[PDB]
């Protein structure tokens, strides 16, 4: 945890980051609802099987 002073020289538009996702299989259509995404700049590797 860090506390720093600065000045904001830009601010991107507000976009939608998923906190939960529901992934459905193409073959059997079964779902894997409510997969907890990590917070911040980070991605998720979908299950392969």
């Amino acid at each position: 945890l860090v506390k720093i002073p600065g000045i904001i020289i830009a601010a991107s538009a507000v976009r939608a980051k998923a906190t939960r996702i529901s992934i459905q299989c193409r073959s059997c259509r079964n779902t894997l609802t409510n997969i907890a995404m990590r917070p911040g700049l980070e991605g998720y590797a979908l299950p392969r099987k």
Binding site: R15, K17, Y44, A45
Partner: protein, 638 residues
């Protein structure tokens, strides 16, 4: 076959509630009448007032505004069922019917800056300015194929999975038969729907001054594709959703959000206008057919005292003349141009703002605030297709409207010359090598100029006091020199009027409070009595709304000059050209050409329209003659 749904309690309840809401015979009948109207007009979208839905059923309103997709599906199923009940033959023509919304959205009425994640899957109403408007592409929803080898015909159905998970099998376009025979797609039998994507930006005036704009992407499906163009102010109501990405074993949390518009409406709700009102207008026209024009003129700008002839001319402008499109394609303009050249503080700017507030399609331009390409059309390159595109300017937008040019005198000679074609023939001819275009701008110009030296020096001729050339002045059909007369009696009149207007207070709404410095309440620009009550503090007067409606109805009428008025106007024009028409010590404020005869004809036609005459009679001709006589001459003192 797969997992079909046998019975669904929530869907059944929703469809029953929506069908009940749509069936209105024990109730007033608004929506039964609306469905009948759309049947008659051959449409497949119904605009349902969220206020009415909330009034008849609060639960359905909350459900529709908080979970829109399936709720709108149920509503559209109910709509199709109701349309089938009214008439099944028409219901069979269209595969589906759509439910657009309107009315007031409490917290769902947001700007592109305020349209955040919290409104995902909800119905939202966003008002903004269009920036980008892609091409209308056809999107295939049902493709017909033919196999020449086996003579078979096939139909492939593609579901609208814009925001739902889509698998490749859904989107596989077939090309070969089961045994690899070639398939030919039959375009005449396949089904395509128009699709477009636009961008809505936070309105520049409503957005915070400091920060950069915020925009939202809007998908318009069939029936909503060419409703908006870049630069327009529009209200889009629809579902704010998330767009699926593409197949991939890795993903960032980021999602691309859009708005699937269910209805789009113009900000120019004032650009468009009951039997009670129609009969009221008829009786108003019939009763006092002679002084109606004068009454309208006096009531035009109630907050400005005097300026009787100026207000008459402004009324003539708002009415406009009658264009003459000849058998050979020749064009004679019908609009009317007024130049208020005046001393400081004589209410010319206030007249401009009045016309801005009143007239439909009124564009405010300033001297140096709208230069060249910003004032007329322009040509640019897409920068993506490397192709040239037109961009409408102030006057192209104001086509069939009015342009209020404040501080017209202080426009560059370049811009003033560029405006000549718009003034005369009402069009902008612009070309770059790639693209040449002839845009229509049949606008009427209302200019507010101050004379050279600041204040009109009455010792010098009007030609000298007006720092404009005769070629430019001839463009303005009416030219009014508005002096700040130093008469103590008129000063008393003006001071009394001003102080009364400053003392006026709103009826009941206000009791001593301060005017406030918007999303909380419905946006007025998009919101859905012959005489005023004779308040003594305002009068010591036709109603604004009735004046608007009457002017709208009288604009369409097309009076035709009668031989008597033609002879009178011709004789008066000959005299006006003659030298005797101006005595000694009187100077012409603008040279008299055939443009002034056209001015006379247009003013007489405007008067006849004010009276709904259907014929421009000697009364109208004499009024136009008198106004021209007042406007085109000035008495210079020594």
């Amino acid at each position: 076959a797969g997992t079909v749904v046998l019975d669904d309690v929530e869907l059944r309840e929703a469809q029953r509630d929506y069908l009940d809401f749509l069936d209105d015979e024990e109730d007033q009948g608004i929506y039964q009448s609306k469905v009948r109207e759309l049947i008659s007009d051959n449409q497949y979208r119904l605009i349902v007032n969220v206020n009415d839905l909330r009034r008849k059923n609060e639960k359905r309103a909350n459900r529709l505004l908080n979970n829109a997709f399936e709720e709108l599906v149920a509503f559209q199923r109910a709509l199709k069922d109701f349309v089938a009940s009214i008439d099944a033959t028409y219901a069979k023509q269209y595969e589906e019917f759509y439910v657009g919304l309107e009315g007031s959205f409490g917290s769902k009425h947001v700007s592109p800056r305020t349209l955040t994640s919290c409104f995902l899957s909800c119905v939202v109403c966003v008002e903004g300015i269009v920036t980008k408007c892609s091409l209308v592409r056809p999107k295939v929803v049902r493709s017909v194929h033919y196999c020449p080898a086996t003579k078979k015909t096939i139909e492939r159905r593609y579901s609208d999975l814009t925001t739902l998970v889509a698998f490749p099998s859904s989107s596989v376009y077939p090309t070969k038969d089961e045994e690899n025979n070639p398939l030919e797609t039959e375009y005449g039998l396949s089904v395509y729907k128009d699709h477009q994507t636009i961008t809505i930006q936070e309105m520049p005036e409503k957005a915070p001054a400091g920060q950069l704009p915020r925009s939202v992407d809007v998908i318009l499906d069939d029936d909503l594709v060419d409703k908006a163009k870049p630069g327009d102010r529009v209200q889009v109501v629809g579902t704010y959703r998330c767009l699926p990405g593409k197949k991939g074993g890795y993903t960032s949390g980021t999602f691309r959000t859009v708005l699937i518009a269910c209805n789009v409406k113009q900000m120019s709700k004032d650009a468009q206008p009951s039997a009670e009102d129609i009969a009221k207008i008829k009786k108003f026209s019939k009763t006092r057919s002679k002084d109606i024009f004068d009454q309208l003129a006096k009531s035009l700008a109630p907050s400005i005292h005097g300026h009787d002839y100026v207000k008459k001319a402004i009324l003539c402008l708002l009415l406009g003349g009658v264009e003459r499109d000849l058998e050979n394609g020749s064009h004679i303009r019908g609009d009317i141009n007024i130049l208020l050249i005046g001393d400081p503080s004589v209410a010319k700017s206030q007249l401009l703002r009045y016309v801005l507030c009143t007239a439909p399609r009124a564009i405010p331009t300033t001297g140096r605030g709208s230069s060249g390409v910003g004032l007329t059309a322009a040509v640019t390159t897409d920068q993506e297709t490397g192709e040239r595109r037109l961009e409408a300017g102030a006057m192209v937008l104001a086509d069939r409207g009015v342009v209020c040019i404040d501080e017209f005198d202080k426009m560059s000679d370049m811009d003033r010359t560029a405006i000549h074609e718009v003034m005369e023939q009402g069009r902008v001819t612009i070309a770059k090598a790639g693209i040449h275009a002839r845009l229509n701008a049949r606008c009427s110009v209302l200019a507010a100029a101050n004379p050279v030296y600041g204040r009109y020096d009455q010792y010098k001729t009007p030609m000298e006091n007006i720092g404009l050339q005769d070629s430019l002045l001839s463009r303005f059909d009416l030219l009014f020199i508005m002096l700040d007369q130093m008469d103590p009696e008129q000063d008393r009149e003006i001071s009394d009027h001003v102080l009364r207007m400053h003392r006026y207070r709103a009826p009941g709404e206000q009791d001593g409070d301060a005017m406030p410095l918007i999303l909380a309440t419905d946006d007025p620009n998009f919101s859905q009595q012959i005489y005023e009550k004779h308040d003594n503090l305002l009068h010591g007067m036709v109603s604004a709304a009735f004046m608007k409606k009457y002017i709208h109805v009288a604009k369409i009428i097309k009076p035709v000059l009668t031989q008597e008025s033609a002879t009178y106007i011709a004789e008066e024009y000959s005299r006006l050209r003659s030298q005797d028409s101006m005595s000694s010590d009187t100077a012409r404020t603008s040279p008299v050409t055939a443009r002034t005869l056209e001015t006379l004809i247009r003013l007489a036609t405007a008067h006849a329209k004010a009276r709904m005459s259907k014929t421009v009679d000697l009364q109208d001709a004499e009024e136009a003659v008198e106004l021209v006589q007042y406007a085109y001459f000035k008495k210079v003192l020594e």
